[PDB]
Structure 1
C-alpha cells in the first residue's frame, strides 16, 4: 500500500517504517525533525531493505500535506508526529495543543481534500484518565488526562470520531499505546532522546552507560507488590508489527477501531531495573525519590481485542526489551550522528 508516515523518523515511527518496508509497502515519511535526525533514514532503508521517501515538513502545513498525499497517491496515513514530553506540556500548553490538536486537524483536513480516508492515530493509555478498573479495556469510557499532552490526545480522539461519523467511509484506528520500550534487534536503531530522558527505560540505560549517577525511583509507597509504580511495557518491534497489521487489516474497513496496544501485563519499576541490570551485567544504581506529579500507581492493558480482531499480540519479552535497549545504547552511545 502507499502509506504516509508522519513522524516517521522518530522512535516508534522509524521502527514501524522498517517493518512496513519489510512487508513491501511504499513508504513516504513526513517529519519536521524537531525530535529526530536525518541520520536515521539510511538506517531505516538498510534495515527495511527498501527505500522510503522522505519529506521534511510540518503536519501543520495543510497545503503541503495535501500536495504530498496527492503527489504520492497515498492510500493510508499513519500519524505518529507530535510533541510528547508530559512535563513540558504543562509548562508550555500552547505548543502541545498546536502540534497535536491543530497538527492532526490540519492533516486530516488535507486528507479530506485529497480524498484519503484510511487513518491510524498514535493515541495513549493516558486517555483512560484516573481509571481504578485495571487492566484498561477499550469499552471503558474515557477520563480526564491530567496534562496538556494527555488532553491533546483525547481531544484528537474525539475529533477523529466526529469526523468519521460525518464521513462514514473513513477507516480510523485509535491505537492506544501503553509503555513503549526496546529497540531494533540489530542495535542499530532505537530511542534517541535529546537531553534528560523522561521515560524510565532510557533513563536506566543512561545510568547504565555511565552518563548518569543513579536512577530516581519516583515513589516507593504505592499500593503495589513492591511499592513502585507498575506499567505495561511493550517492545517497540511488537508495536511496529501491530501497526503493520492494523494498517493492512483495517484499510477500507469503515469505522472507528480502537485498540489497546500493550503486553497485557504489569511490571514494577524494580522489575524493569532488575531486568536491565541482568542485561548489562552489572547492577544498575538507583535510589528512591518522591512520587512524580501526575503518576498513577499501576495499570496495564487488556489487549484481548487486538488479539481477537487483528490476531495481534506481543511476542517480545521484558528481557528482550531491556537487552535490545542495552545493545543500542551500548553500540551507539551518542545516538544518531549529527
Structure 2
C-alpha cells in the first residue's frame, strides 16, 4: 500500500514508518519538527520507498501533498502532545490537534484516501471513569485541553465518515514508552527517568507518587496501527495498552533498578491537568483486531534503558 504518516519525525511515528517499510509499503513521512527529531529518520536517507515532506498540518497545502502522493491510508500522529503545554496554551493545542485534524480530513476526502487512522489518547480522554480497566464504552470526560482536542478529533473524523465515507479508526494508546522517546521532552516519564538516572541528575515524582498509568511498549502500539489500517473497526476507537497499573513511584523503582544505583526521587506538587489514574481495557482490540501487547514493563524498560546507554 501507499501510506502517509503525519508526525513521522516523532517517537511513535518514526517507529511506525519503519514497520510499514518492513511490511513492504511505500511511506510518505510528514512533520514540521515541532517536537520531532531528524535523527529519528536519518537512517532512511537512501531508502527509495520512503519520501519525507516537511509540512505544518495547520497551514500547509495538505490537499496538494495528498494529491501528489495518493496515500491509501493516512496514519495521523502529528499533534501537540504535552498535557501541561495544553493547559498553558489551549488555543495552540486546539489549532494543531483539532484544526490540523480537520484540515487533513478535508484534504483526504478529496484525494481518494481510503482511511485515516487517528491517534486519540486512551490515557487522558476518560477522565475519572467508574471503571478501571476502562472500556471504550465508558463516556469521555476530558480534564485537560489536550484530552478535549483528542476527543474532538475523533468526533470530526466520525463526521467525515458519515459525510463522505472516508473510513476512520481511532487508536487510543495508554502511556507509550521505548526507544526514540525524547530524553529531554516535557512528557515521557520513562525517557525522563532513564535520562536523569543515567546522568546521575535529580528525579522527581508528583503528588505522593501514587498516580498510576498503563505503560505500553512502542512496538505493540505500532502493531495496533498496522492491524487497524485494514477495512475493519470503522468509526471505532481501540484502547491500546496493557490493562495493568503502575504508580509513579513503582515506575521510578523499575527504571532505577534497570539503570542501577539510587531509588530516591523528590516529591513535587501535583500538576494542573494531570489525571491521577489511568488503565485501559484492551478486550475490544483483541476481539476485533486480534491485537495483544507482547511486552511486559520489566522487559520493555530493559530494552529502553539499553537504547539510552548506546546513545
Which TM class, normalised by the smaller chain length?
A: over 0.9
Cα distance, 1:110 vs structure 2: 0.6
Q: SS state of the match for residue 103, structure 1? A: helix
Rounded Cα–Cα distance in structure 2 between residues aligned with 1:44 and 1:228: 41
- TM-score normalised to structure 2 length: 0.93
Work out which of the residue numbers 159, 181, 186 in structure 2 matches 1:197.
186
Partner of residue 126, structure 2: 128
Aligned-pair RMSD on alpha carbons? 2.0
Q: SS state of the match for residue 160, structure 1? A: helix
Q: SS state of the match for residue 27, structure 1? A: strand
Cα distance, 1:90 vs structure 2: 1.3
Partner of residue 223, structure 2: 241
Partner of residue 170, structure 2: 174
Q: Specify every segment of 5 or more residues in structure 1 that has no aligned partner in the other structure, as ranges.
A: 184-189, 221-226, 333-338
1:198-277 equivalences in 2 (<5 Å): 198-210=187-199, 212-213=201-202, 215-220=203-208, 228-247=210-229, 249-250=230-231, 253=232, 255-277=234-256
Partner of residue 66, structure 1: 63
Spell out structure 1 runs of 4+ moving beyond 4 A. none
Q: Deviations over 1:301-325 (max 9, x none)?
A: 1001111111101001101221122
Q: SS state of the match for residue 279, structure 2? A: coil
* 1:159 and 2:156 are equivalent in the alignment: yes
- TM-score normalised to structure 1 length: 0.86
Paired residues in the alignment total 310
Cα distance, 1:56 vs structure 2: 0.7
Q: SS state of the match for residue 54, structure 1? A: strand
Q: Deviations over 1:115-164 (max 9, x none)?
A: 21301001002111221321110111222x12221111111111111221
Contact 2:3 2:25 in 1 (8 A): yes
1:1-338 equivalences in 2 (<5 Å): 1-44=1-44, 51-61=49-59, 63=61, 65-125=62-122, 126-143=124-141, 145-167=142-164, 169-183=165-179, 190-194=180-184, 197-210=186-199, 212-213=201-202, 215-220=203-208, 228-247=210-229, 249-250=230-231, 253=232, 255-332=234-311
Rounded Cα–Cα distance in structure 1 between residues aligned with 2:43 and 2:198: 22
Contact 2:72 2:112 in 1 (8 A): no
Q: Deviations over 1:25-65 (max 9, x none)?
A: 1100011112123232223569xx874210111212353x1
Contact 1:83 1:100 in 2 (8 A): yes
Q: Deviations over 1:227-284 (max 9, x none)?
A: 611111000111111111211x33xx48302100101111122321222122112234
Change (3 A) 1:254 1:305: closer
Cα distance, 1:193 vs structure 2: 4.8
Q: SS state of the match for residue 100, structure 1? A: helix
Q: Specify every segment of 5 or more residues in structure 2 that has no aligned partner in the other structure, as ranges.
A: none
Rounded Cα–Cα distance in structure 1 between residues aligned with 2:151 and 2:272: 20
Contact 1:121 1:173 in 2 (8 A): yes
Contact 1:62 1:107 in 2 (8 A): no
Q: SS state of the match for residue 108, structure 2? A: helix
Rounded Cα–Cα distance in structure 1 between residues aligned with 2:25 and 2:200: 39
Q: SS state of the match for residue 118, structure 2? A: strand
